[PDB]
PDB file of C-alpha atoms and ligand atoms in Angstrom:
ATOM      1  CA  UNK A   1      91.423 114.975 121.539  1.00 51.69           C
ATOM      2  CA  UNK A   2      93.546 116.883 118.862  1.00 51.55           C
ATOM      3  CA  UNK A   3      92.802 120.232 117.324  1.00 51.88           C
ATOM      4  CA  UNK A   4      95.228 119.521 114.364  1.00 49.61           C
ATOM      5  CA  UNK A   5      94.669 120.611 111.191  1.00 50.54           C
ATOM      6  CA  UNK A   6      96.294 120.331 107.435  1.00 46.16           C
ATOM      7  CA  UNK A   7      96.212 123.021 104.483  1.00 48.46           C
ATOM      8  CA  UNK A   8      96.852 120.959 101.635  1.00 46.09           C
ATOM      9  CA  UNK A   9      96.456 120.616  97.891  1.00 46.67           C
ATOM     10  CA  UNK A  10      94.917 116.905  97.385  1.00 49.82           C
ATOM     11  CA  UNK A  11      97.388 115.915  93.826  1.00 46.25           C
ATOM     12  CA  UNK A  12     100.275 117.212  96.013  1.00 44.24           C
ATOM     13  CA  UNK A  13     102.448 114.504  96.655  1.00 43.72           C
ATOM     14  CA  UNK A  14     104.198 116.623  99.469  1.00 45.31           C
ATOM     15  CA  UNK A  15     100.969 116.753 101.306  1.00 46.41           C
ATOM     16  CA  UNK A  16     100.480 113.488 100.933  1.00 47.75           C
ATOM     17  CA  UNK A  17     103.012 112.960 103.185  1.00 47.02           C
ATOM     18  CA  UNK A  18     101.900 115.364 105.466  1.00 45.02           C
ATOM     19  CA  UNK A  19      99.109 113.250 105.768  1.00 43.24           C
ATOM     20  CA  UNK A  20     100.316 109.484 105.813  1.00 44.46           C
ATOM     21  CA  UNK A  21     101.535 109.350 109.797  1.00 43.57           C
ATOM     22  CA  UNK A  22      97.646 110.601 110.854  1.00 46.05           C
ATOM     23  CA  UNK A  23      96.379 108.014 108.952  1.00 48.02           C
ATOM     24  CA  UNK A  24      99.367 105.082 110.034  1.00 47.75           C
ATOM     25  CA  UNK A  25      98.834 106.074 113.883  1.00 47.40           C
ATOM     26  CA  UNK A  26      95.289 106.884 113.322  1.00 48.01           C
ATOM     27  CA  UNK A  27      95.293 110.209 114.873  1.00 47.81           C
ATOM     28  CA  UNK A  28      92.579 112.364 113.883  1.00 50.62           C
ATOM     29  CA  UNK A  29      93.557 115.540 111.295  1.00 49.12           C
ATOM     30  CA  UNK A  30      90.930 117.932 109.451  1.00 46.48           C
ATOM     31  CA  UNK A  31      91.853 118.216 106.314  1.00 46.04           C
ATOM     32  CA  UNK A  32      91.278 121.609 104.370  1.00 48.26           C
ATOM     33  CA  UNK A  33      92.405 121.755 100.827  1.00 48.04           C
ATOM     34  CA  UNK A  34      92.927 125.265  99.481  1.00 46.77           C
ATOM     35  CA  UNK A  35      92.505 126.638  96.100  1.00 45.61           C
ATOM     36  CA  UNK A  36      95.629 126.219  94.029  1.00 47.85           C
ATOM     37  CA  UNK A  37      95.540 130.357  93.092  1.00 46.86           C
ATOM     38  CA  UNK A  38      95.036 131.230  97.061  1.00 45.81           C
ATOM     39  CA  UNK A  39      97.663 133.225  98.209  1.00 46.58           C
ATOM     40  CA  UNK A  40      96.269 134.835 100.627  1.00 45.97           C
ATOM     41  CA  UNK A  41      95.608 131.968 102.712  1.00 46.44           C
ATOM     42  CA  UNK A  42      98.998 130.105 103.176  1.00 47.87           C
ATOM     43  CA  UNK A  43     100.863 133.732 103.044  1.00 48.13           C
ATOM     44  CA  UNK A  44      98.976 134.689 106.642  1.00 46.57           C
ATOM     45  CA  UNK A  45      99.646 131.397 108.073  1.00 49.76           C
ATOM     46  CA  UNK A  46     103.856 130.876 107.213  1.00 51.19           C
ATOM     47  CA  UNK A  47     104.169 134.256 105.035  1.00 52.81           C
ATOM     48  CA  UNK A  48     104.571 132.539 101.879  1.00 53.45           C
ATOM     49  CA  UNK A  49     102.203 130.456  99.391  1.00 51.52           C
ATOM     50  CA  UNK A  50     103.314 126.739  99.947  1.00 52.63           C
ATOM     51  CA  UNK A  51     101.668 123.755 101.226  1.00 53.02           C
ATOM     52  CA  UNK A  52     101.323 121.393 103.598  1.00 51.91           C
ATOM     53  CA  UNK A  53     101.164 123.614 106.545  1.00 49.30           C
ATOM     54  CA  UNK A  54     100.095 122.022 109.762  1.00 52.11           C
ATOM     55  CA  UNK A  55      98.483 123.559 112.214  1.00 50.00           C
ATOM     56  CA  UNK A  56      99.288 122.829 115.847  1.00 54.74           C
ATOM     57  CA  UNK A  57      97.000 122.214 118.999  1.00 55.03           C
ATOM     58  CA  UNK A  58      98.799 125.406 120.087  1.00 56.10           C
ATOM     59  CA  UNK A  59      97.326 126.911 116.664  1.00 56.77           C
ATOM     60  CA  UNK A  60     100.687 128.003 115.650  1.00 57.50           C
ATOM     61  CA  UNK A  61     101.704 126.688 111.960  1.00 58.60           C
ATOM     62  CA  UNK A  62     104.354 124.301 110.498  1.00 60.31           C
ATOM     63  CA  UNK A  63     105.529 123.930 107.056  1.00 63.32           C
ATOM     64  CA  UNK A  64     107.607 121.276 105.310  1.00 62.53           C
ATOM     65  CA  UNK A  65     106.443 117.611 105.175  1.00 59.04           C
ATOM     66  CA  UNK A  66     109.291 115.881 106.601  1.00 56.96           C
ATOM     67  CA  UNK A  67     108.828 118.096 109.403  1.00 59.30           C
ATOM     68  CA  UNK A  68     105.098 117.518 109.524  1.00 57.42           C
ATOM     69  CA  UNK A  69     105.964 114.133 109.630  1.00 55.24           C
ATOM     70  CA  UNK A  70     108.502 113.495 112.153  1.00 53.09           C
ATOM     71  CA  UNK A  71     106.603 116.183 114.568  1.00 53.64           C
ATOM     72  CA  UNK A  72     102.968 113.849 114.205  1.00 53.91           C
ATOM     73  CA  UNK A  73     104.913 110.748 114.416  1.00 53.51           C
ATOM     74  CA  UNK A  74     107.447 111.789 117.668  1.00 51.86           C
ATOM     75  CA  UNK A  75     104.042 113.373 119.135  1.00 53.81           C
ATOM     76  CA  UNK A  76     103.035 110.722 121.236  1.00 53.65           C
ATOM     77  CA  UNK A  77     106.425 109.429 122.163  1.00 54.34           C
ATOM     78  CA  UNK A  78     106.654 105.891 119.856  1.00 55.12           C
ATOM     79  CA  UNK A  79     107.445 106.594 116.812  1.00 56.89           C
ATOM     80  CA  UNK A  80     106.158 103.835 114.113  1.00 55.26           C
ATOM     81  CA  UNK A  81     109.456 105.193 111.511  1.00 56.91           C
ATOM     82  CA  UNK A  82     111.562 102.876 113.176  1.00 58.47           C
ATOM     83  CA  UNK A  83     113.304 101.197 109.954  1.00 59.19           C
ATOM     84  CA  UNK A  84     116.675 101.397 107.776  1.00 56.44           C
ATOM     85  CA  UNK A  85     116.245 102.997 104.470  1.00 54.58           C
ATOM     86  CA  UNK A  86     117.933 101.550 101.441  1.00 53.77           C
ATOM     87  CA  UNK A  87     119.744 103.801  99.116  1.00 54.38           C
ATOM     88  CA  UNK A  88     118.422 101.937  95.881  1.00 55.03           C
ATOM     89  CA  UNK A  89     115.175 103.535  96.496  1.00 55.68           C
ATOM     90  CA  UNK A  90     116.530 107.014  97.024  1.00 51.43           C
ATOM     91  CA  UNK A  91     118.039 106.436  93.479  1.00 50.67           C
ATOM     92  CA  UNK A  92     115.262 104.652  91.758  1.00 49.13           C
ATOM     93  CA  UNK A  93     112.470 107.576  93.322  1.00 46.45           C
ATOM     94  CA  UNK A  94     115.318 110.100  91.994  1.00 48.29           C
ATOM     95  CA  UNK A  95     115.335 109.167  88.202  1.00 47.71           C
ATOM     96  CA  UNK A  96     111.447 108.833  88.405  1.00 50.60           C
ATOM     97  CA  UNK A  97     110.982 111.522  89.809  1.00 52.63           C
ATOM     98  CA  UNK A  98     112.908 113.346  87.367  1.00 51.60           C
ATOM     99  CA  UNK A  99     110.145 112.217  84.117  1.00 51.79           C
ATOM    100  CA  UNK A 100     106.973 111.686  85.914  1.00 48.39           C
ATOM    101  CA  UNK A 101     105.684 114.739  86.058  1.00 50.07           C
ATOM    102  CA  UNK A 102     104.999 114.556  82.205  1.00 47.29           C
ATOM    103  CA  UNK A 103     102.656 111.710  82.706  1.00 46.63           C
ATOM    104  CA  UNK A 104     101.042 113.519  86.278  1.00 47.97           C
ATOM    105  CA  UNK A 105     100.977 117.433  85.401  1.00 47.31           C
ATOM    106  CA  UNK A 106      98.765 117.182  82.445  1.00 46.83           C
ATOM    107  CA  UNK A 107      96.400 114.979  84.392  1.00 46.05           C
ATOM    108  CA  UNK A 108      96.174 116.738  87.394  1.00 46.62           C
ATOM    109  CA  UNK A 109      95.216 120.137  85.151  1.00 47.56           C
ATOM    110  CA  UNK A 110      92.039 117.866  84.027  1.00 47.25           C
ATOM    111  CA  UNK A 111      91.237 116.038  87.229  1.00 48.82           C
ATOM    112  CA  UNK A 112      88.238 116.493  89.576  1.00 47.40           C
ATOM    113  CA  UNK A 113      90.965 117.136  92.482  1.00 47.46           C
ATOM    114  CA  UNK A 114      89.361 120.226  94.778  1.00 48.28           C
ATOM    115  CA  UNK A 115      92.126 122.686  94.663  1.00 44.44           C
ATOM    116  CA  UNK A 116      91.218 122.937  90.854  1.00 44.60           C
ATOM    117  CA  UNK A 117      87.099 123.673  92.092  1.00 42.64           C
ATOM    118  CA  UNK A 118      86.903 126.579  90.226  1.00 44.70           C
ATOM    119  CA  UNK A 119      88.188 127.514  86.340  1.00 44.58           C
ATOM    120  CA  UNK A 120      90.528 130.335  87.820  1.00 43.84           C
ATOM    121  CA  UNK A 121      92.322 127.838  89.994  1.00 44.65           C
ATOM    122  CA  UNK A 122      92.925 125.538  87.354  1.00 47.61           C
ATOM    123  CA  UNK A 123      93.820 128.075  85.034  1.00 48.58           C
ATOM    124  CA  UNK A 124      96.755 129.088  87.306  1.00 49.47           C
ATOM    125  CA  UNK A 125      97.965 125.570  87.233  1.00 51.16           C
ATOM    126  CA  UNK A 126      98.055 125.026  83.977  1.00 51.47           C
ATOM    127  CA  UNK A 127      99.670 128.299  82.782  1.00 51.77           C
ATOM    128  CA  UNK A 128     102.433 127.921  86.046  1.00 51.30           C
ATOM    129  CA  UNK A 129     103.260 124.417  85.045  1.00 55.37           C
ATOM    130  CA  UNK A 130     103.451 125.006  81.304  1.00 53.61           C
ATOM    131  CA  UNK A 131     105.805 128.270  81.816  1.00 52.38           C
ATOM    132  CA  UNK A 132     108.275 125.713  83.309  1.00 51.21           C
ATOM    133  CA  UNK A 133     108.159 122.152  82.253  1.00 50.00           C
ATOM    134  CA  UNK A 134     106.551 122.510  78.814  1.00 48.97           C
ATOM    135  CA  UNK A 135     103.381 121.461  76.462  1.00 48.90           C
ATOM    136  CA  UNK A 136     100.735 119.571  78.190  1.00 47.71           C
ATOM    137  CA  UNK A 137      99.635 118.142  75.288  1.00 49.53           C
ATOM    138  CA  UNK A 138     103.068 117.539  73.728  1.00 45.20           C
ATOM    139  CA  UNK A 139     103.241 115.211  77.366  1.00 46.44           C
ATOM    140  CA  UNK A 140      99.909 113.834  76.564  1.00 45.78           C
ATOM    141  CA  UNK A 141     100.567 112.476  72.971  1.00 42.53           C
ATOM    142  CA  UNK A 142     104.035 111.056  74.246  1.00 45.05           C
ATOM    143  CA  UNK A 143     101.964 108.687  77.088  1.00 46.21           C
ATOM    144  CA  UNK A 144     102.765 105.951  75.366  1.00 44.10           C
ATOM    145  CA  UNK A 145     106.299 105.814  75.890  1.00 46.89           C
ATOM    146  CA  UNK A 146     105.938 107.495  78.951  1.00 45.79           C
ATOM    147  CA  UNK A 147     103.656 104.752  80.517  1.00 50.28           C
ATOM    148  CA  UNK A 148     105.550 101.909  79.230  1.00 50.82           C
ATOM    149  CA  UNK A 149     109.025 103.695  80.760  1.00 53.66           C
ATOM    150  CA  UNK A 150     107.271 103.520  83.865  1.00 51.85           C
ATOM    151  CA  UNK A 151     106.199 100.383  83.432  1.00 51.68           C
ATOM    152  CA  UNK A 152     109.786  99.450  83.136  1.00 49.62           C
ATOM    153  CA  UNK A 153     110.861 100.918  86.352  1.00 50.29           C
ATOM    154  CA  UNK A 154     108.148  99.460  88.146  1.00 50.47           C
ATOM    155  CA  UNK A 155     109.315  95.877  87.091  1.00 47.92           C
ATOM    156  CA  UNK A 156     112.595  96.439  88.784  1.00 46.27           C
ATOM    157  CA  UNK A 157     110.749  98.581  92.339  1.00 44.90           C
ATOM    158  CA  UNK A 158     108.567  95.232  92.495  1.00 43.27           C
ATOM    159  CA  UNK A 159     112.238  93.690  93.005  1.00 42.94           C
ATOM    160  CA  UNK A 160     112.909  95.503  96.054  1.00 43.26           C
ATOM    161  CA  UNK A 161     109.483  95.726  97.803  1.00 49.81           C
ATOM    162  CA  UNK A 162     110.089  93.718 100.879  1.00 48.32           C
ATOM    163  CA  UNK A 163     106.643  93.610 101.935  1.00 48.75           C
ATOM    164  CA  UNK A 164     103.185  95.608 101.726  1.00 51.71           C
ATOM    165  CA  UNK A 165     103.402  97.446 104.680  1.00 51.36           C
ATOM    166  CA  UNK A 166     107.067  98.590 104.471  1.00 52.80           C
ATOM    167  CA  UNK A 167     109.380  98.992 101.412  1.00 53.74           C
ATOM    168  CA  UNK A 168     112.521  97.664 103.463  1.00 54.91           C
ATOM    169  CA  UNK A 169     110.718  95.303 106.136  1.00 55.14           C
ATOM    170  CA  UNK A 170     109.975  98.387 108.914  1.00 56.82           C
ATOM    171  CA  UNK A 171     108.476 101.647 107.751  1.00 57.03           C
ATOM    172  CA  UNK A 172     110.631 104.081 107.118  1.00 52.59           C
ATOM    173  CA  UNK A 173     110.873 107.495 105.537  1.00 53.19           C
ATOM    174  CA  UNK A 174     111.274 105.633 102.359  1.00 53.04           C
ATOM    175  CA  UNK A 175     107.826 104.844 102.517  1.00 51.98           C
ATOM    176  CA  UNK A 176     106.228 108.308 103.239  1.00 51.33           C
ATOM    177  CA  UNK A 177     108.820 109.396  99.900  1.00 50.43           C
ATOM    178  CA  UNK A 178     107.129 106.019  97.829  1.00 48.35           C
ATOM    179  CA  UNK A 179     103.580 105.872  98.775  1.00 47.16           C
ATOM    180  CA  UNK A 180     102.912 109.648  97.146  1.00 46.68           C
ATOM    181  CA  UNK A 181     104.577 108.522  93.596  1.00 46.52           C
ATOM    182  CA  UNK A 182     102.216 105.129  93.623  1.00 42.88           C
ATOM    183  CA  UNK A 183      99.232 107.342  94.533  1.00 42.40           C
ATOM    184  CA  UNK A 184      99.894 110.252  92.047  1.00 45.95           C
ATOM    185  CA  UNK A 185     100.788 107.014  89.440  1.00 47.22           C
ATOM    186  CA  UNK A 186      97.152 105.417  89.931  1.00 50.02           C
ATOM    187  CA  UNK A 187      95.656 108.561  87.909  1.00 51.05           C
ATOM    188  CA  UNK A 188      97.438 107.382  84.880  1.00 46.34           C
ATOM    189  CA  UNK A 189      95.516 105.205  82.956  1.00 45.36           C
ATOM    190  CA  UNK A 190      97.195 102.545  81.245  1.00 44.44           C
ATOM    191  CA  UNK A 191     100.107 101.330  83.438  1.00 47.48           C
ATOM    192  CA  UNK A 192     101.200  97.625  84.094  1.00 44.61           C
ATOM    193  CA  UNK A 193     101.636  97.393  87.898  1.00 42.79           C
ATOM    194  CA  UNK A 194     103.741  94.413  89.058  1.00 43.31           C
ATOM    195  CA  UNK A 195     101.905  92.414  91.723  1.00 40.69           C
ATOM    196  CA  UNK A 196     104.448  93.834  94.895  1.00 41.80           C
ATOM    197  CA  UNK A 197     104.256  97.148  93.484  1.00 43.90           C
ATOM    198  CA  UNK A 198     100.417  96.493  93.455  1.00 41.57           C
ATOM    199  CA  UNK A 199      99.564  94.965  97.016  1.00 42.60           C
ATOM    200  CA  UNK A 200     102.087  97.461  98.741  1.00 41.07           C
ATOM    201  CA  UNK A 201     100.188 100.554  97.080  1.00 42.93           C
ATOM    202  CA  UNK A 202      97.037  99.284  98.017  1.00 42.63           C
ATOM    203  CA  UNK A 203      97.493  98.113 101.585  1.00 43.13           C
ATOM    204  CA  UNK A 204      99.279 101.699 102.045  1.00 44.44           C
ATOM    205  CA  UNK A 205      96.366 103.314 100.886  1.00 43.33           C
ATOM    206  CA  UNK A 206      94.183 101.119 103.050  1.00 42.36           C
ATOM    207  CA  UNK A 207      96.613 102.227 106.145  1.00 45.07           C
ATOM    208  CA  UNK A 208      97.399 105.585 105.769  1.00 44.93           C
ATOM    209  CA  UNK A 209      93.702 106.823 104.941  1.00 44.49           C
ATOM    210  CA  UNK A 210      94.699 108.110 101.384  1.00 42.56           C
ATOM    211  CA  UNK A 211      92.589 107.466  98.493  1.00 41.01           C
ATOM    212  CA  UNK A 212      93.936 106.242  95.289  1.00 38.50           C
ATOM    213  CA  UNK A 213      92.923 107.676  92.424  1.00 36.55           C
ATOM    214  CA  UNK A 214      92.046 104.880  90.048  1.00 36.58           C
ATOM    215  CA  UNK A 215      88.470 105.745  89.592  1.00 35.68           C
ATOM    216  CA  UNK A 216      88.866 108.950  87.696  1.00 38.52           C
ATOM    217  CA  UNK A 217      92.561 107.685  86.067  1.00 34.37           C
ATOM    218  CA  UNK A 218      92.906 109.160  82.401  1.00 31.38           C
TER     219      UNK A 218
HETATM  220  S1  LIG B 301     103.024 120.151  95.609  1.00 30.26           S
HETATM  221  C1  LIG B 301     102.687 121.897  96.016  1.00 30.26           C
HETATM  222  C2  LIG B 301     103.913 122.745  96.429  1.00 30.26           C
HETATM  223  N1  LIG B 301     104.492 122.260  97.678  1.00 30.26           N
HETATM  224  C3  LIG B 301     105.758 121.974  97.853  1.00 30.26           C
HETATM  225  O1  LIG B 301     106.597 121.874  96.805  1.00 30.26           O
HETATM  226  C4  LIG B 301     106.256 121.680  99.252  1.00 30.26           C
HETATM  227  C5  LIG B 301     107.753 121.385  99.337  1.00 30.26           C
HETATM  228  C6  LIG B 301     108.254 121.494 100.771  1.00 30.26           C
HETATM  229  N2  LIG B 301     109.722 121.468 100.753  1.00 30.26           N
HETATM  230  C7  LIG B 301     107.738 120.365 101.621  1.00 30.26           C
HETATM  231  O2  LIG B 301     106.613 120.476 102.145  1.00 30.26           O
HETATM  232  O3  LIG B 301     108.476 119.349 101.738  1.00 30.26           O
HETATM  233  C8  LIG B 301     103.531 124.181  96.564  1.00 30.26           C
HETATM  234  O4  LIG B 301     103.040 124.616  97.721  1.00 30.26           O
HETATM  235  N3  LIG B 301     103.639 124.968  95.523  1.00 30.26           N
HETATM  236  C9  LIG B 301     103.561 126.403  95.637  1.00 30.26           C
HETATM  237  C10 LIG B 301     102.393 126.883  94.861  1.00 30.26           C
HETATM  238  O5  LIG B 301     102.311 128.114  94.621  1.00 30.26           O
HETATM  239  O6  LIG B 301     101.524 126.037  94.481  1.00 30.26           O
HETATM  240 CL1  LIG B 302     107.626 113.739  96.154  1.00 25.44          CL
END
């Protein structure tokens, strides 16, 4: 029995994390996901609005993924991050990272995703994320290029896959950085997935208990 529970926004690839080692080790988690303009909520819990926050069979609260992560894993004394990482996929997550929000922020703002429930909470996304990384709809009519630049850098990530259920052979932290990009990726329609890049996203998903979001991709 576990009383753990996890304050997350669904699109965030940070809570994502949060919630890949419950799903991995298949220990239980309620999920809540907050509105994306509640402040209140997070600020009683850690003092400040940011997400995931866990909260602890002892009911006190912890912040920061990585955190979240090694605490659920190192809970019941066997780890399952037991692998290497490889610094190529530090790199290649660090130059996607660095474009990829053009293709994800304009598609979260018109996705069904349950932090966005009601028009005020969506509002507040938009307006936040346009104040700091630009035009949503200059992104949109550039998805062209966009999709087929990520289609490039997928070719090469397909290279270095080792296997489905571990981007260097064991899992690693390199997989709980991965699996969130892949995820956040399957709302874009359009993409060419190589076939590693493919089976490792979708046996992840199947693992971790984390949807993908193909059905409603735009
Ligand atoms: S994706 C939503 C935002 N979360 C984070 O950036 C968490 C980063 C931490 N360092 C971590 O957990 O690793 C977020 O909460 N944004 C603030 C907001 O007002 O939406
Ligand atoms: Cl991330």
């Amino acid at each position: 029995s576990n009383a753990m529970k996890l304050y997350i926004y669904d699109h965030c690839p940070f809570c994502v994390k949060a919630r890949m080692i419950f799903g991995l080790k298949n220990i239980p988690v309620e999920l809540n996901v907050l509105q994306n303009d509640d402040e209140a909520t997070p600020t009683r819990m850690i003092g400040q609005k940011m997400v995931p926050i866990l909260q602890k069979d002892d009911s006190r609260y912890l912040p920061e993924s990585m955190d979240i992560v090694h605490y659920v894993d190192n809970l019941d004394g066997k780890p399952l991050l037991t692998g290497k990482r490889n610094p190529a996929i530090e790199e290649w997550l660090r130059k996607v990272n660095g474009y990829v929000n053009q293709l994800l922020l304009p598609r979260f703002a018109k996705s069904a995703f349950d932090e966005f429930s009601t028009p005020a909470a969506r509002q507040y996304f938009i307006r936040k994320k346009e104040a700091s990384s630009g035009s949503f709809d200059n992104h949109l009519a550039h998805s062209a290029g966009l999709i087929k630049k990520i289609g490039d850098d997928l070719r090469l990530l397909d290279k270095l896959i080792v296997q489905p259920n571990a981007v260097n052979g064991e899992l690693s932290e390199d997989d709980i950085h991965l699996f969130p990009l892949l995820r956040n990726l399957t709302l874009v329609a359009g993409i060419h997935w190589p076939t590693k890049v493919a089976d490792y996203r979708d046996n992840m998903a199947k693992q971790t208990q984390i949807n993908l979001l193909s059905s409603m991709a735009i």
